[PDB]
Amino acid sequence: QNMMVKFAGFLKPLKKTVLAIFLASLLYTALGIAGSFYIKFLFDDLIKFEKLNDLHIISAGFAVIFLLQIFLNYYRSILVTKLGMSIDKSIMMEYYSHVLKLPMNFFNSRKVGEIISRFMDASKIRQAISGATLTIMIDTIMAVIGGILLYIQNSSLFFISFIIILLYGIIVTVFNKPIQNANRQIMEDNAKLTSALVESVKGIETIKSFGAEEQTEKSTRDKIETVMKSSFKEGMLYINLSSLTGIVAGLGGIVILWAGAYNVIKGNMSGGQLLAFNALLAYFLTPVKNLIDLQPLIQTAVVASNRLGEILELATEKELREDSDDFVISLKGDIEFRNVDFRYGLRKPVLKNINLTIPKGKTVAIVGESGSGKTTLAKLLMNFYSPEKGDILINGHSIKNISLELIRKKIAFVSQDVFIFSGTVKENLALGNENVDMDEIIKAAKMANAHDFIEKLPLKYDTFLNESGANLSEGQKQRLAIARALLKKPDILILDEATSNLDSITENHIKDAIYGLEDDVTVIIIAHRLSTIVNLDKIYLLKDGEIVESGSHTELIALKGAYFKMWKQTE
Amino acid sequence: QNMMVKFAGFLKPLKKTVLAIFLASLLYTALGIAGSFYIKFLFDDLIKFEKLNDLHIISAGFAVIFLLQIFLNYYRSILVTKLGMSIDKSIMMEYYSHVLKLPMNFFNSRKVGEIISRFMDASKIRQAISGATLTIMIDTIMAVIGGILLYIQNSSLFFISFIIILLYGIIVTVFNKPIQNANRQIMEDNAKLTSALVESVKGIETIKSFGAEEQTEKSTRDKIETVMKSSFKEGMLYINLSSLTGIVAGLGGIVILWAGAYNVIKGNMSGGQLLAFNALLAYFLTPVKNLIDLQPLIQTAVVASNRLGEILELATEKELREDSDDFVISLKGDIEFRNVDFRYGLRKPVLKNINLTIPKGKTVAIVGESGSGKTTLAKLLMNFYSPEKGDILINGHSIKNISLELIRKKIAFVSQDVFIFSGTVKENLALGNENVDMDEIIKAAKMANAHDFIEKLPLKYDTFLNESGANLSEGQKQRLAIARALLKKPDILILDEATSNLDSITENHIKDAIYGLEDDVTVIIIAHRLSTIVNLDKIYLLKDGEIVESGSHTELIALKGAYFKMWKQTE
Ligand SMILES: CCCCCCCC/C=C/CCCCCCCC(=O)O[C@@H](COC(=O)CCCCCCCCCCCCCCC)COP(=O)([O-])OCC[N+](C)(C)C
Ligand SMILES: CCCCCCCCCCCCCCCC(=O)OCCCOP(=O)(O)OCC[N+](C)(C)C
């Protein structure tokens, strides 16, 4: 694991609060040890000799001592809570910051519910780090002073206490591995249940439309039964651990009283001294038993931290990248696919020996039937995925030798589905560019024909868009995406079926807009309708991951090939 | 509370378990009380008279008593754990079933992360119904016997130890409202953080493409900071509660020893009797303080249960329906919209004064631009939403007097976006009628051309599909949706732009299949391309929630209106 080393890093700045906690703990333990002698003073001196005034005076003094140690415990609890909140905040921030940067094949291969559950199985790390748990660990460490004093008082009774301690330590090891496995098994089942719940909430309209509420109930019921079986198996290990710990504690107390009474009879002690030993055992055995009782909480936190570190061990997208050529400053130039092969993991290949050469500052089209792999080409250009064979070149430089930030800032991608995040229209338009002038946003919205309906909104570029832009129409969200892409001022523009829901008036406006750009930006159009690609320089027809033919519209029509058949059938 | 009544009713079948728990706890308390007298015999008979053999015999007897007590505690804990598992099972299943049965307006106004947080906050209820918390409540209940014995032994010390109980009650009452509010605030902030994380996971492609990882880290960091502040505010209420209860406990113990020593000096008790009284306080004051120490868990579980009950108080999709007429068994008739007005919530109207009749058994096309209200019309026909004014009449009877099962069993909807759930291809194609004959799936799949590509799969119809059908292209998913809708054998078939991604050959085959039906199945085709509605019987044009042009293709062209303009522009 790396979490123990990472834990020490968090406490490095706080080298002054830890000292205060240590000193407060020392004072608290010393005051408790001092106050443990009250029963000895009662039974050896005050009760035997009937000293009422001394009874009152020493009782008040010990009450004052107890109040002092309570005030000390209040002081260190605040510092411990502050440290716990700081550590938990750092852990959560690091995990989210890392999970944002992971490669794209991580999100494809993982259900949303799994990631959500892994993130939200982190409140369990707060519980084992909160004010009371760290206080109990500190008391367990401080129990050394109590043990030393107990040895100073009696030897045989200290050895009995030591045997009790060893029996505590033996039980912990036996229940260490079984409790982790039981806590890990329930976490996976909880992740599966959360994934099922998320998936059922997603397709609730389809569930209702088909009357599939009962089947979903049965499936989630089976998952709940699995979770409850895991929890029950994990919940009976706690019963065995608690029963063994209670046996040890109670029998050790009875044995200590037995041996102390034997010593008192033999004359090696007195009743007051034995009672003081029993009272001082609260600072040698009680903290240890409290730690053993908290052990399941620590095991749950450790399992959750290990599950988080499983994600944190994955290398991010920038860590899998070869060195970047600093001479490349712009992505303007010819785009070439050189024998590109790609398959989504280990399945059948999607692209087989792909060969394009898109001239710089030219508008080209990639067309084909659904599933041919046009969006896969667009995502390879965006460098979401890497070709298994061949390479993609921009102006003679491999796309793997260009910095990822430059690639993702100089290439604009408009997808089939538009993602609208919770915020105003202004915030959605300025995504990743929250320092742009307002006039530029107006210019982009006008260029994408999005200004007209935005100015008709109640807030006029401040309208809080709900989740997934429900209040926005299907063709209104596409115009927002196109405006967001144009606001980027890119060097390569990819329109992946961005005009499917737009009307003729709007599509003509956007067509002139992307036609009116400088003769240095490359516009790549991925379209399913052939009526929107007639006036572009070159058209590549993709048929199951292969450029079977290419050329302008006139040349493709004057070939009587697959493109001519597509044009005749689709028109 | 209402939630408490449900949990108590969950205990009605399990009545013999409760009796066994009660008897075992009675025996446990009696044995503990009997064993608390060990220190009385030590310090009054065995030590005073130096009896050694009697010391060994009595110590062995009390060790046996303690072992019996531990065995009884083990048995009772097992029973309590099983009871708590059953209760939590029932709670989870009830909440999931209800949330599945909720109306479509609930899922529109709520983010997914809120529902997922509310469901998984039920893990907080599991802690309060654990095998250790219920044991502490039962011990607190049984503490009445210990209190009676303390009163019988010494009235003065019992009165002193009774004030400690009152001070616990006052401290708990004072810290009752503040603790619940902090828990609600923390849970709300956690729900917001979960919603943010879910939304970020959904749109990871856009976030990566626009370089918004840094911008998305600031929002989530702010939400994490809000959660941390809310947690620290609750973490200081617990510190105050613990400090006050510790003050009461320690000062009460010191005062009890003080007054006991005074009584022993005055001759009202003996040295052994005072120690026996203090040992017997482990069954009067210790259970109460242990219960008070669990106030955070109980309050957190109460808040979580209240949050669940907030959802459970909703009226579902079937309790809002009127008295359904049972004389309707088939939705075969003229569908009519009579002055139907509808708006999504309090926003602008979507459909205004729609008059639209659909002849029985004919094919009808509804067309227009995006945002016109076509999918809204389809969802109104499916009873997903209710019109504000006017009625929908599938036949002479209104559609709100038809059973909701019949509406969702005789009308098939093929939405624009196809939802595929994690399972086999055969499991997805049933989705509501899993008992379909295996030969009936082939007939539906061959009608939708889904059989050809399904046969070219590893496990054929048993091939496992991902959570979103990533391995299936858009055309394949649309064909699966069409096959699933046809497999239902409906009376009204709504094709909501289902053939947008389909090939010309596939579209022609599916249109041929649609042509050949029972001659009484009404087909509604919501289309964006006007070339796919040429041969349909009647066409309605939607212009911002108004039916402006109606008629066949020849009449609409002959009218030379809005539909003529759309035809000229698009084709
Ligand atoms: C499921 C359970 C069912 C069965 C359980 C069976 C349990 C077995 C129970 C056994 C009871 C033991 C009886 C002790 C009574 C002492 C009598 C005595 O003479 O005192 C002697 C102390 O004797 C010792 O030194 C220590 C002996 C006890 C071992 C400690 C066991 C720890 C707690 C056990 C927890 C068990 C938990 C087990 C967890 C698995 C005094 O000796 P001395 O000569 O005066 O000293 C000389 C001093 N001088 C040199 C200064 C002069
Ligand atoms: C602020 C938080 C502090 C928490 C502490 C709570 C404890 C409060 C309890 C105070 C009550 C103190 C009562 C002391 C009783 C006492 O100290 O006295 C006992 C009387 C028994 O005496 P009695 O049975 O009558 O014997 C004959 C003797 N005499 C009458 C002949 C003198």
Ligand SMILES: Nc1ncnc2c1ncn2[C@@H]1O[C@H](COP(=O)(O)OP(=O)(O)O)[C@@H](O)[C@H]1O
């Ligand atoms: N996220 C994914 N994981 C696995 N396979 C995928 C994924 N996305 C697409 N595929 C498969 O790879 C092929 C690529 O097609 P796609 O990129 O969707 O092109 P188009 O835009 O023409 O649909 C599809 O046939 C699909 O089955």
Ligand SMILES: Nc1ncnc2c1ncn2[C@@H]1O[C@H](COP(=O)(O)OP(=O)(O)O)[C@@H](O)[C@H]1O
């Ligand atoms: N879940 C929703 N919440 C609020 N408004 C919505 C929702 N769904 C649709 N609308 C609004 O209702 C109108 C009708 O849209 P819709 O009929 O779904 O589009 P289309 O006709 O292209 O299918 C749209 O203008 C949209 O703003």
Ligand SMILES: [Mg+2]
């Ligand atoms: Mg695509």
Ligand SMILES: [Mg+2]
């Ligand atoms: Mg629609």
